[PDB]
Design a protein around this ligand. Sequence first.
Ligand SMILES: Nc1nc2c(ncn2[C@@H]2O[C@H](COP(=O)(O)OP(=O)(O)O)[C@@H](O)[C@H]2O)c(=O)[nH]1
Ligand SMILES: [Mg+2]
Length: 386
Amino acid sequence: TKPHVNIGTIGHVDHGKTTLTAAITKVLAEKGGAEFKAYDQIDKAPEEKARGITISTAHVEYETENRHYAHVDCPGHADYVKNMITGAAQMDGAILVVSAADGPMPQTREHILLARQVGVPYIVVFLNKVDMVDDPELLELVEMEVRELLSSYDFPGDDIPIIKGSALKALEGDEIGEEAILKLMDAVDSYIPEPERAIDKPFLMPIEDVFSISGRGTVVTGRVERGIVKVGEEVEIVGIRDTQKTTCTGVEMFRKLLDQGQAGDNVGVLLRGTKREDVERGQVLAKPGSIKPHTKFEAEVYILTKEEGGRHTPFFNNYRPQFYFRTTDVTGVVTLPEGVEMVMPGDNVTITVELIAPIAMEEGLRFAIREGGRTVGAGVVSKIIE
Ligand SMILES: Nc1nc2c(ncn2[C@@H]2O[C@H](COP(=O)(O)OP(=O)(O)O)[C@@H](O)[C@H]2O)c(=O)[nH]1
Ligand SMILES: [Mg+2]
């Protein structure tokens, strides 16, 4: 029945992200929509290790009248960096927590910048610790500050809901505290839209393997990432070489002929007229017009540390690694932003990349940076250039 939304608390350390998360689960538990997870349980977040990288993330779930939420919260700034860039945590929206007594702090800025770079589409703000601020005008001035900062990263600062409260008082069962948590959750319900179903997006399928079979022609295999491909419809073959257009004449799985393949399906797709030598791993099938090939882009990247399997020395301007996009490596040259001389292991930064061959790409596409077949970085395309 209820639509599902993924969110998380972001913001500077000590501003009350965890207290707020705990208060949400408490106040919703009390309305019959969650198990109360106490502060210590959320704060002592399990470390999860995946692809060399350890991230501490608390996962909590709750529901309002309208919606079901999965909510993430992390102890440290570095967990946010890694989750948001690697996509180990996805957010359809974020609750930005700012201490009203401190105002925005450097990770308040960094998390907003990250939200922009990795495509978090909406922010709601909880201005926390108002029990520490007795002056209403000071409160308004902090709020105005948060709005200016949000707008400076192109979020709609004038329209973003900002709820003022004390997460700590809510935890202590103060009624005014609790009402703020409920106003926060109403704003989340109404402002953060439920994301588009993968099935409704334009068809896209990364090609993993290509086959030329006697009396069948050219077959490509992979997983449909999004949308639906139907026998008889046209598809573009995008990336690496000039775009080509053809007709899907078949979709199949082991011992199963299909009329179509949808998001999540691992299928073989028969391409009418297409020569095996014109298709390769690293291209995508797509809805015609829906995605273009590019060589040049900006990305937010996280560079692994030595302990994660990464480099143990910095790189510099013109570094020339591989970029693993979906299924294949393409070499590219890295340009660093003005004011950045070097990128250390464990840093995150925005870079410009120029690949030696085009890839079907769009904002939000993730990739790995590799050196000699070893992953040294994780990125997400933040802007297409030209
Ligand atoms: N006075 C006050 N303190 C708070 C409030 N919310 C959190 N704190 C305290 O600020 C500290 C940091 O809170 P925490 O939720 O761990 O911050 P996080 O680092 O953002 O997750 C803890 O001592 C909290 O109890 C609040 O509304 N008022
Ligand atoms: Mg915390």
